[PDB]
């Protein structure tokens, strides 16, 4: 067989400022969210209707309307408000800011690719440190190496005075620079192949010669591994420092808006100046927006409460991955307290009228309309709300053959959710079969269950042919039966099959019972109070010897001179003869063993006859 | 004996839902009986559906 090939993929990659612009194209320039009076989206703000899309689909910021492209006065599109959930914006940062994930997280990717200690980069980005010789692909004329913490006295007055201002600034950012701009310049002019070769040769030199002699090696292996991945992909190492800041769509942030304001609050302040301190404030605003809590003390709000960043909202047990994506709340679902029903079949459950009418509402509407008892959908829904007596006939009709899924709360294995055929029961409780309680680990002291309705034909087929209880009698753990009688049923069976009192518990003195043609006679005598449940009796047996008993020789053989002999065992009597081939069997038993055997036999025979 | 009647009773626990209001961001059905919300199919319930192999029942409760 040729496999039905399906080649589907998804990939993440570090994004480019050009791709950010293509997302937004659309720049958010003002930190205003809404008008204080009219509660309208402020233009160029975090909720700008021109940037992100029309609130109240098909209307402009002015108030015009068109049938569901751009307006002239306010320039708002004519589309659905769906776009406000997907359209991105961007913030044009005056200075580049590094991405916190790629600088502060350990081990730092920027530090390893640039090959400098992390404290040096942190001082360069946060403190007032200037880096010497940031780029190499352009010539220089100075002998400043490393990152001098102190400002160079000559570079402050002498060289700027000799080299004036315009040309000096023209060649300024080629020998000395500071902040994330220097880091981005270093990343942009990196030669990755040279990095790989230098790392390999240094690794060989170290090897040809014992803790940090190894840790330096692991850095070299890590760096050339990191350098290789940039060559074969389309990612650029300078994208780890951000030039633009994408903005979340407004409808996803109806806390986050506060952090977006601060970026605009401090970036628009910085562009007014154009100073070192304000550049750092913009960088910290982006870090708090992107990832709080990595920089030691996390920035708090006025209430001394830690802000929540995108990393916080995507990670953790309550994050997007583990709470919104791996589990969902669903429609066509109900819940109620479960009570025991011993008269139910193993494949049936009982549903309250309210839960059933809610879950099967659309099917009841179809049933109403189909037989001309409802003119339209609205009339049918009004009839359903009025609890008309004909709503329940249609509900009972449409529930036939449509399975439902029950589920108890702590689903520890797959038998924690099973499929049953719903029937309408009075009250407000879910009627549950007693033999399926062990699979659900359910008892009737306050437990509740959820109900789900498969809608499509494929789901109904799956529920009927895979999840019903009569095809799930074995547990997948070891293969043992899961629907075994327990407690009350087990006690009843034990009492039924506990035979006669024997020995000194039957007779007061040392002994120095009715005979029934068939089991029906014995059971009839029991019904007429002629015998007890455990009183001994002899039953004529006309089948093969199939009674479980100890493998023992007869207690006593009564051999007659005419040829017939009687063999007396502990639990049966066998009459044989030498003249004939006759062989009679009488079983010493009670009405209880007969009843158990007849129950199982009649179950088998009735199931066979019904098919 | 002396038997008590407790607050935990039906008429305060029976809940049903066909469809209705959804969350503003996640667009999933609401949470809570008072809000006419739906029942949550968590990851442990998703594991059970994957144990049965019912891939179309699972997609209904996901999309």
């Amino acid at each position: 067989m040729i496999d039905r090939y399906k080649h589907q993929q998804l990939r993440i990659g570090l994004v480019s400022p050009q791709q950010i612009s293509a997302w937004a194209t659309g720049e958010v320039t003002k930190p205003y969210t809404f008008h204080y009076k009219t509660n309208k989206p402020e233009k160029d703000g975090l909720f700008c209707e021109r940037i992100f899309g029309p609130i109240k689909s098909g209307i402009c910021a002015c108030g015009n309307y068109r049938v569901i492209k751009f307006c002239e006065q306010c320039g708002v599109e004519f589309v659905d408000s769906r776009i406000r959930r997907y359209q991105m914006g961007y913030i044009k940062l005056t200075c580049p800011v590094t991405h916190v994930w790629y600088l502060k997280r350990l081990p730092s990717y920027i530090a390893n690719l640039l090959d400098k200690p992390l404290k040096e980069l942190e001082g360069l980005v946060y403190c007032d440190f200037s880096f010497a010789r940031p780029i190499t692909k352009k010539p220089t004329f100075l002998r400043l190496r490393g990152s001098f913490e102190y400002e160079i006295q000559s570079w402050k007055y002498s060289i700027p005075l000799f080299f004036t201002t315009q040309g000096f600034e023209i060649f300024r950012n080629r020998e000395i620079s500071t902040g994330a701009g220097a880091i981005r310049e270093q990343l942009a002019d990196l030669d990755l192949r040279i990095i790989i070769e230098n790392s390999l040769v240094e690794w060989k030199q170290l090897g040809e010669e014992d803790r940090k002699i190894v840790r330096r090696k692991d850095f070299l292996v890590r760096r050339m591994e990191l350098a290789k991945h940039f060559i074969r992909t389309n990612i650029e190492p300078e994208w780890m420092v951000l030039c633009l800041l994408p903005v979340l769509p407004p409808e996803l942030r109806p806390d986050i808006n506060e952090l977006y304001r601060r970026v605009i609050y401090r970036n628009n302040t910085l562009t007014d100046l154009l100073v070192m301190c304000q550049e750092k404030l913009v960088q910290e605003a982006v870090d708090t927006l992107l990832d709080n809590g990595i920089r030691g003390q996390p920035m708090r709000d006025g209430h001394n409460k830690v802000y929540k960043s995108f990393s916080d909202v995507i990670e953790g047990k309550e994050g997007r991955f583990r709470e919104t994506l791996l589990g969902k709340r669903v429609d066509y679902s109900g819940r109620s307290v479960i009570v025991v029903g011993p008269s139910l079949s193993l494949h049936r459950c009982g549903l309250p009228r309210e839960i059933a009418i809610e879950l099967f509402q659309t099917f009841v509407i179809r049933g109403l309309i189909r037989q001309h008892l409802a003119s339209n959908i609205g009339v049918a829904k009004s009839q359903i709300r009025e609890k008309k007596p004909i709503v329940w006939e249609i509900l009972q009709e449409v529930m036939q053959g449509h399975p439902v899924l029950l589920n108890r709360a702590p689903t520890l294995h797959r038998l924690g959710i099973q499929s049953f055929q719903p029937i309408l029961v009075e009250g407000r409780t879910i009627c549950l079969h007693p033999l399926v309680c062990k699979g659900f680990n359910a008892d009737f002291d306050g437990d509740q269950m959820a109900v789900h309705v498969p809608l499509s034909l494929e789901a109904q087929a799956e529920a009927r042919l895979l999840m019903f209880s009569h095809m799930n009698l074995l547990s997948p753990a070891i293969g043992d039966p899961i629907s075994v009688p327990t407690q009350d049923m087990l006690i009843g069976l034990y009492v039924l099959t506990s035979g006669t009192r024997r020995g000194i518990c039957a007779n007061r003195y040392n002994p120095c019972e009715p005979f029934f043609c068939n089991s029906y006679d014995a059971i009839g005598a029991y019904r007429q109070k002629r015998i007890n449940l455990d009183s001994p009796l002899w039953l004529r047996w006309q089948l093969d010897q199939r009674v479980i008993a100890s493998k023992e020789v007869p207690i006593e053989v009564h051999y007659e001179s005419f040829g017939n002999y009687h063999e007396i065992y502990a639990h049966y009597l066998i009459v044989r003869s030498v003249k004939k081939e006759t062989l009679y069997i009488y079983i010493r038993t009670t009405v209880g063993h007969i009843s158990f055997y007849r129950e199982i036999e009649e179950a088998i025979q009735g199931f066979s006859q019904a098919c | 004996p002396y038997i008590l009647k407790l607050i935990h009773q039906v008429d305060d626990k029976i809940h049903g839902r066909s469809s209705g209001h959804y969350a503003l961001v996640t667009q999933q059905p609401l949470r809570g009986r008072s809000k006419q919300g739906g029942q949550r199919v968590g990851e442990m319930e998703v594991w059970a559906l994957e144990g049965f192999g019912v891939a179309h029942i699972l997609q209904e409760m996901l999309t």
């Binding site: 496999d3 039905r4 494929e458 799956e462 | 994957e50 019912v54 891939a55 179309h56």
Partner: peptide, 17 residues
Amino acid sequence: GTGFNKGDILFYHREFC
């Protein structure tokens, strides 16, 4: 599970008779 392995001549030409 169920998702495995991706789930006119002879006319207008009769005998004139």
